[PDB]
Amino acid sequence: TNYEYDEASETWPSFILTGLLMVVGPMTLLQIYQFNEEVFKNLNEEYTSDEIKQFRRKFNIIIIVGWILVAILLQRINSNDAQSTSHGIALPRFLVDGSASPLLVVCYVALLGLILPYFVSRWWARTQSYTKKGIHNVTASNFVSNLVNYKPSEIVTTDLILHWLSFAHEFKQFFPDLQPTDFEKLLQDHINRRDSGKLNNAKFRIVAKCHSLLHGLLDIACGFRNLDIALGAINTFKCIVQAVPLTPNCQILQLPNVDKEHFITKTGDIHTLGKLFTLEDAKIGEVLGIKDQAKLNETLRVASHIPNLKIIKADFLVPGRPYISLKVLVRSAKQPLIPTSLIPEENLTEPQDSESQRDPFAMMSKQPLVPYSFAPFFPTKRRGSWCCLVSSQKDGKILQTPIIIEKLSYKNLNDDKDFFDKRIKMDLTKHEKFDINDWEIGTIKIPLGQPAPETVGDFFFRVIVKSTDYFTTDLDITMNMKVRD
Amino acid sequence: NDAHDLYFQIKEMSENEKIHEKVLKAALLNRGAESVRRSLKLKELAPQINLLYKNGSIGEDYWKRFETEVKLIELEFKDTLQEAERLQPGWVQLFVMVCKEICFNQALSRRYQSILKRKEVCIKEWELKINNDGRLVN
Amino acid sequence: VEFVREGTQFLAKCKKPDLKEYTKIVKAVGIGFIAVGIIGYAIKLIHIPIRYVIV
Amino acid sequence: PFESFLPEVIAPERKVPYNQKLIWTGVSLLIFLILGQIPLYGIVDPLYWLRAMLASNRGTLLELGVSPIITSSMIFQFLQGTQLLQIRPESKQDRELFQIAQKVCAIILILGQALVVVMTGNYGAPLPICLLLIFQLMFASLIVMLLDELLSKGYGLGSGISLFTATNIAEQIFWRAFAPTTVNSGRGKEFEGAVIAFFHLLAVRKDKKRALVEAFYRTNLPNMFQVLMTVAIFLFVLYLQGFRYELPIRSTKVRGQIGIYPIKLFYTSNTPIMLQSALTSNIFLISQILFQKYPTNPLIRLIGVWGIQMALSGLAYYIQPLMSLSEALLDPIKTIVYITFVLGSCAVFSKTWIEISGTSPRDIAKQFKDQGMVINGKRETSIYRELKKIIPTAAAFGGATIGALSVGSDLLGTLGSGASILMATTTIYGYYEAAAKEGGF
Amino acid sequence: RVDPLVVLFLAVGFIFSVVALHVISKVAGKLF
Amino acid sequence: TLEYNANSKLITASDAVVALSTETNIDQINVLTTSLIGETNPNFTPQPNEALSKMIKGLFESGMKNLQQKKLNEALKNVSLAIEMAQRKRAPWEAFAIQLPELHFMLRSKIDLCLILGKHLEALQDLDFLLGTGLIQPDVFVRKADCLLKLRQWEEARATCERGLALAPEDMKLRALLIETARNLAEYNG
After folding, report:
1. Smallest CA–CA distance from C23 into chain D, residue
2. Where do the structural domains in chain C lie, given as residue ranges?
3. Dihedral angle over CA of A445, A451, A457, A460, nearest 10
4. For E12, which DSSP code?
5. For chain F, does the N or the C end have fewer beta carbons within 10 angstroms?
6. Identity of the residue in A15, A85, A123 whose CB atom sits nearest the CB atom of D184
7. For residues F128 and F126, what is the distance between their CA atoms, to the nearest angstrom?
8. Are residues A199 and A267 in the same domain?
9. DSSP 3-state of F174
10. How far is it, in rounded angstroms, from Cα D21 to Cα A264?
11. Which residue of D has its CA nearest to B54?
């Protein structure tokens, strides 16, 4: 029908009052109604450069305002003095018949002709250009076009993967002024621990974005069933995370403060962590050349915490879809080797329940997260990771995407069991503090992702578990499935 | 990154410089070999690109670009065969097999030639110290 | 009287939801229904003064 | 089969994620709903039932609504049920021809219906305005049909008809609750919304012991007690959604696949209630028409007599729904016959729909033999006998429960019809369970 | 053939055209 | 660009800096025309040549005779010359299944000779090429693991030993090599 507006402020005050109360009340009631040790999150901030700190730093009132405005409106209502039916509306009169007769209509016409379609178009263009992995489309096109015409002759090194990475498209929108050669030179300056001079705020950004690009390259390489480029990708990612060039003796140059001109020239037989720890405590400082107790303690405490893995038991499992089961023992570089026989065999076995039978990965989904890494030259803070990829043994081709596990228990590294050292050589397993139920055993499960062959016989497989933030010891074992039916 | 326009460049230079006649057949065989190699490469790469597409990690444009390249390569091969027929009368039933062999043979030749360059990469990457006679001197 | 007997048997054979599932279902249904209804109400309200003014 | 080159929206090659689907659903709904408020330009037989069921309102661009689309789909569904089109799934060209025939007959149906309404409607006979007015409706129906096709291709959470119906139901429920309009009849200006008038009387009257008893009952306009009844029935029907039967199943062609087949209680809730409502609306229409046209006749008086308008002492009198408890206690046999009719109707409608739509226990058994799935703890030759002991009883009990909830809502006098509420809840729970079984934000 | 943004632009153009026709027909009588 | 020589009939790139693909294609065309100059028949056949194969066999026998004379220094040079000739002066359009096996058989003897003499890196690279070009048998993995351990690459040593055991696990040498590489790696860590 034909309504009549309130021109004497008789109804719209209560209208606004209830409209505010119905959204305030829920807010008030909602407001009144309301594991894994990490020791690098404190030590990292002391060895990071100051410019990196500057970079990393650089790049409820609604309830009370609603209550007070409700109070004002309530007082305004209380201050007012206040057979055919006359229809009426609650909106005031000057909103429809005053001097603002074209204002409201032009504002609505604007909100219908400009803001909606333009914003929808921008959002569509922003969410249609990105691939599911989280990278641009031109970058994925470039990576596939580079893997297609790739001769088997050229041996994959770090430089070739850097040369592929400096062709990414996400590096153009960041700095439309630079060129691919500038990006390659910047990444070289980062890896060699060299200074950019003026483009530091660009080098840091491109290095920070390098992670997702390397993960995209790894996934597509595993897609094409090409192993060597995936291995190169993981190695280059280690290199960029740790800021060290890839050479034979790198496990010892990943340390915080070691001098190359002294270490390379004096000794040439120390190549890894165990061979290092075999020496005495003063000999380590003497060979590394830092001669500072207050600083030697820090380097020992960081070199005694980067996790090396080891296999205990691994075998197939045959549900409707097979999935591999791994039993690894995460240890540090100091604990001596403990045999497999003393393991009580209880933790290794799996309890058979309906909930566990339905989804066996539920138990793995419970273990804690991994701590923050030790990346004194990576801009942000990164968590450790573990990238596991499976390969066949008949021809040597990757046959599934890399499953990137994240959860693992690093408890066996804590400073509680320091009595278990290798330099004592006194058969330390028979100690009073040794508890065979105290050593925790992580567990990693990889879905096989492919149906079992219908033939009957032996079939070889091979699983790799490489680290992605340190230069520690990894896994490379060959297991075979004995299909018998 | 192709040896197609090189044949046309050689033809244009022959139109004026009076080069010998066998060089034209040589360039034609080269073009044919490249065509057959790319045909095999596409035929053997189709399924994995299809899988990466259906997984939803490549986008939509490259799939169509690939499908177009599939037939562009065949069209190029047919035009090359026509040019070969124009070059010599009754020379099509043997050209296909000659091309099929030269492709594989030069592939092996390149893979073998690569080792002289490949040999020093490992030296640089592992910091070896090798004197003459290829022995180790620690 | 056999039909209600079979009905009771079937309901005893069915599964009644617990609290942790009931609360999630009711939260989802409530938020969806409210998000539809509020839009309907606001679009029915705003078009009264404009349809009055332009016509 | 013939040649056809007409516009149609393309389906995506890959599965679209949850957010790009939800945003499209929301924006399509916003466009469809704005298309329902704007009045025509050429303006200068009221069917409340059809316009309430078909999501249409007079005096706006959306006066036709989804009626031509739904009637074309129903015509082709009936023709496919009668085995006349002999549609065979062995060919895709036949399916393309059928789906393009749907649209090329829908458009001419829109043209015919619009010509009819412009020739008979109350707009007026007095040509440029006529062509403009027919073009307006043509364009509006074309846009709504494209929106339907888009949301049905896969870009949206589901179809369009059910979503629009749920939208209208929820909008009407909220408008009957937070209405800002007022009426002045002797006493003064009173809000037509329950909570609005409740808070207004709590604020300005300052006589609480009388204001509460005046605003809580409100024998003349909607009150808060009806809102309480609505939210109570809402929670009840939502709790009634989880009732389902689960039997364990296993595979035989491929070993190691153990699962559970669910059999819910609300099997085919949607169709029978809207069918029976359409039949009652049509019967009331025809009875009013015959009573208006003919003064008195034996059969005219027997089929129904209208009085104070409402039917009285006739066959149409019995089928009318009850208003309150007063009429219930007045004539018990009338309540009895009405309840039995409404229950038997939904029961038989559920039965015929589960027999026609292809969800018969024999069909499920044949589908299981196709998939090779077998009961976990039972043999193969007994699966059909087991479905015979579950499916019909479950369907009948579900239909009876829907009828009971509807009659209870109608007797309690809720803000909206119980059928509308249950449809809204079941259709949105469909989306919820789809998102749950699929997995998304 | 047609993309979703095409349909949305068609709808927006239709609605804005009807509203503009109304406002022009109204102002025609008010100015003269 | 490109300049055409007159008497040599060799196309040379007269530009200053050219990509690698252009160089490779130009060399291939040079070899093709050099072979077509000698081949006189218009309808050349994939049938292999005879005199070239005879010369190859003669050089191979001249090299192998030094082993009977126990001359371990010149036999390698002779086999290298024979391989170079068989690779160079053989027309590319000849049959594949006859040019591949001769190269493989000669290269295997060359690998054995180079490993016995005392050169290691060349042996490892030859083994890798021979294994990559499509021949996988336990007669290769043992020598590859030997060369790897000789020039101190331990992780790859265990890797190749395991791949080798993954094909003929009944061997008696792969297990000894696995034991030795496990011991060396345990020393390399411990």
Report:
1. D239
2. 1-55
3. -50
4. H
5. N
6. A85
7. 5
8. no
9. helix
10. 59
11. D14
